Amino acid sequence: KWTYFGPDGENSWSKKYPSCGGLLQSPIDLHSDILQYDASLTPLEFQGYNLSANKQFLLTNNGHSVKLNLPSDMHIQGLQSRYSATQLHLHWGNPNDPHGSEHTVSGQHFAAELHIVHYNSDLYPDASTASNKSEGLAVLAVLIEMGSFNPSYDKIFSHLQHVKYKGQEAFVPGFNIEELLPERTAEYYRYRGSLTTPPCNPTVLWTVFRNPVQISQEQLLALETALYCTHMDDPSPREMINNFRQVQKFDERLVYTSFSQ
Amino acid sequence: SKWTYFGPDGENSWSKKYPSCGGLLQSPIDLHSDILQYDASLTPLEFQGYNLSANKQFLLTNNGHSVKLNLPSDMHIQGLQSRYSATQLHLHWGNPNDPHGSEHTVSGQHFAAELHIVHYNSDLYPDASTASNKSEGLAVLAVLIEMGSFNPSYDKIFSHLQHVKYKGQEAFVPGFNIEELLPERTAEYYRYRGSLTTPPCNPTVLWTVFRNPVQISQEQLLALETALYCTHMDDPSPREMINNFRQVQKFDERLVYTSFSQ
Numbered sequence: 143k144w145t146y147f148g149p150d151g152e153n154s155w156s157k158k159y160p161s162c163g164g165l166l167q168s169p170i171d172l173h174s175d176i177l178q179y180d181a182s183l184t185p186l187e188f189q190g191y192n193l194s195a196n197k198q199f200l201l202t203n204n205g206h207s208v209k210l211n212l213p214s215d216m217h218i219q220g221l222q223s224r225y226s227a228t229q230l231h232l233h234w235g236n237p238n239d240p241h242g243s244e245h246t247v248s249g250q251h252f253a254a255e256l257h258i259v260h261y262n263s264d265l266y267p268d269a270s271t272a273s274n275k276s277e278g279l280a281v282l283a284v285l286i287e288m289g290s291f292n293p294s295y296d297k298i299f300s301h302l303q304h305v306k307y308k309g310q311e312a313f314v315p316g317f318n319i320e321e322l323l324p325e326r327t328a329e330y331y332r333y334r335g336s337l338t339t340p341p342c343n344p345t346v347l348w349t350v351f352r353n354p355v356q357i358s359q360e361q362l363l364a365l366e367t368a369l370y371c372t373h374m375d376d377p378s379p380r381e382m383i384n385n386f387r388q389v390q391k392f393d394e395r396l397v398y399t400s401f402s403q
Numbered sequence: 404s405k406w407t408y409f410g411p412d413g414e415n416s417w418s419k420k421y422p423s424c425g426g427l428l429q430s431p432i433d434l435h436s437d438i439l440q441y442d443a444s445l446t447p448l449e450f451q452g453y454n455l456s457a458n459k460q461f462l463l464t465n466n467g468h469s470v471k472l473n474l475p476s477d478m479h480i481q482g483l484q485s486r487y488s489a490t491q492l493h494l495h496w497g498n499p500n501d502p503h504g505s506e507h508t509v510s511g512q513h514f515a516a517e518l519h520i521v522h523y524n525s526d527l528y529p530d531a532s533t534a535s536n537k538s539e540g541l542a543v544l545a546v547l548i549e550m551g552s553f554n555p556s557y558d559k560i561f562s563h564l565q566h567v568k569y570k571g572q573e574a575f576v577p578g579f580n581i582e583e584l585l586p587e588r589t590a591e592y593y594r595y596r597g598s599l600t601t602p603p604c605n606p607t608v609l610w611t612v613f614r615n616p617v618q619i620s621q622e623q624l625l626a627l628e629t630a631l632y633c634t635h636m637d638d639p640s641p642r643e644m645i646n647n648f649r650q651v652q653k654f655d656e657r658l659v660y661t662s663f664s665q
């Protein structure tokens with residue numbers, strides 16, 4: 143029902159999904175005036191991220207992004223509750239304007255952004271149940287820029303051709319998801335915000351790593367050109383591009399940083 | 404109730420009552436290199452009748468969303484494919500703790516504030532309201548405002564703010580030369596097809612954003628950011644008129660054309 147373009151684009155989400163017009167909306171611009179060091183922001187530990195090579199994980203095109211399903215034995219340690227993984231997915235721009243991260247830093251978009259979605263499995267039985275509840279979700283965000291070829295990201299990207307159309311699926315053999323994370327994961331931005339897609343629930347604890355990863359210009363072009371938001375037999379195909387939300391106002395609030403220099 | 408820039412009636416909800424706010428060609432936008440293209444046909448505009456007589460006076464009104472100055476229809480811009488006559492000017496700004504309230508951004512950066520001088524196609528239409536619902540019915544000039552030196556010209560407006568503090572209030576401003584509000588090198592500008600930045604968000608505006616900003620002082624910005632209320636003088640739930648700018652919009656395949664190549 144919802145899209146990133148045309149009549150059903152982001153300014154219209156609030157019609158069907160009232161939280162998209164509510165409080166605590168993400169993404170935001172991360173800029174100096176609103177950052178504040180917080181010594182409580184100790185390093186997260188990424189447990190069960192080294193997925194069994196003997197297991198397969200489902201990659202899907204759901205018409206909005208490409209998503210990889212993740213097992214609940216994968217979790218973040220270091221928050222008050224255990225947050226167990228549910229899925230990862232990406233956001234990107236287009237070849238004419240290849241700057242499609244969701245979060246910005248000092249007003250600047252990165253080329254793309256990876257989100258690893260987790261839910262509070264101490265309090266809730268599954269992500270769908272957690273998604274509208276207090277302390278429900280935690281998302282890790284990795285900013286992506288163009289640079290050297292990244293073999294780890296290619297463990298996902300090499301399957302994109304098999305998920306070109308909405309509803310298509312592919313199986314991805316387990317690999318170490320921590321390989322998708324940047325250098326010095328101890329350095330991150332932290333704030334309370336929302337899902338960046340409908341229903342936009344304000345239930346996400348965001349962790350945006352300070353440092354970006356790189357992927358090659360060919361990898362970024364593949365991501366931007368491989369997918370459609372329509373079914374294979376749609377007589378009016380639509381490319382899956384520019385699948386990021388514009389930044390939201392963020393007033394009288396701070397983003398906390400784990401770094402001081 | 405009535406549309407605002409904050410809370411349940413804020414900009415993500417405008418489309419619920421004003422469908423064009425969720426439609427195509429929306430403004431403002433971020434002006435950045437990937438979407439700019441030089442166009443040598445973008446020749447200089449001519450500002451005609453901008454020198455308003457100091458012996459005449461012009462109505463300043465707080466309309467609940469901004470402060471606007473009414474302008475006479477003998478003021479026009481020449482150089483477009485019709486003559487466009489002025490109707491009003493108004494501003495957008497941030498707040499005292501965050502003076503970063505321009506609408507358009509440049510390479511992801513907000514300016515302190517923004518002036519819009521709204522014109523309508525007087526060759527074709529009898530009034531701006533009629534023009535507002537027609538293709539290229541409106542032409543808006545935008546001036547980006549930076550915190551810097553005191554600006555005596557802008558103070559010709561700002562010195563009257565304590566007299567239009569509440570919605571519906573009106574004051575008179577003696578005429579002055581409106582071209583004094585424009586920046587250096589007006590020949591250098593960005594041009595694109597967009598919309599009103601407020602409900603009803605009509606996609607009927609030819610935008611001209613000048614390349615160079617003007618400066619007003621910190622004290623001028625603070626006055627602008629503290630003087631005004633969105634609400635009537637007797638409202639038991641007053642709302643400060645702050646942060647009256649829309650977030651930038653997706654570009655939806657549009658380019659912005661520049662009169663400068665570098």
Ligand SMILES: NS(=O)(=O)c1c(F)c(NCCCCO)c(S(=O)(=O)CCCO)c(NC2CCCCCCC2)c1F
Nearest residue numbers: 206207231232233257259269270273281337338339385
């Ligand atoms: N950016 S995000 O991390 O806030 C995020 C998403 F962007 C998206 N959209 C994918 C990105 C689109 C452009 O790249 C999804 S979804 O695909 O499940 C939505 C539609 C399902 O019919 C979720 N899923 C959450 C919210 C919805 C319900 C399920 C449980 C919790 C996780 C999510 F958390």
Ligand SMILES: NS(=O)(=O)c1c(F)c(NCCCCO)c(S(=O)(=O)CCCO)c(NC2CCCCCCC2)c1F
Nearest residue numbers: 468469493494495519521531532535543599600601647
């Ligand atoms: N930013 S803008 O240039 O798109 C713009 C405005 F922002 C606004 N609102 C002031 C800005 C509020 C926040 O600073 C106005 S208005 O006040 O006349 C009427 C609306 C309620 O306010 C017009 N004027 C046009 C609107 C439509 C029809 C009537 C005739 C004049 C043209 C306009 F073109």
Ligand SMILES: [Zn+2]
Nearest residue numbers: 231233257338
């Ligand atoms: Zn996401």
Ligand SMILES: [Zn+2]
Nearest residue numbers: 493495519600
């Ligand atoms: Zn305006």
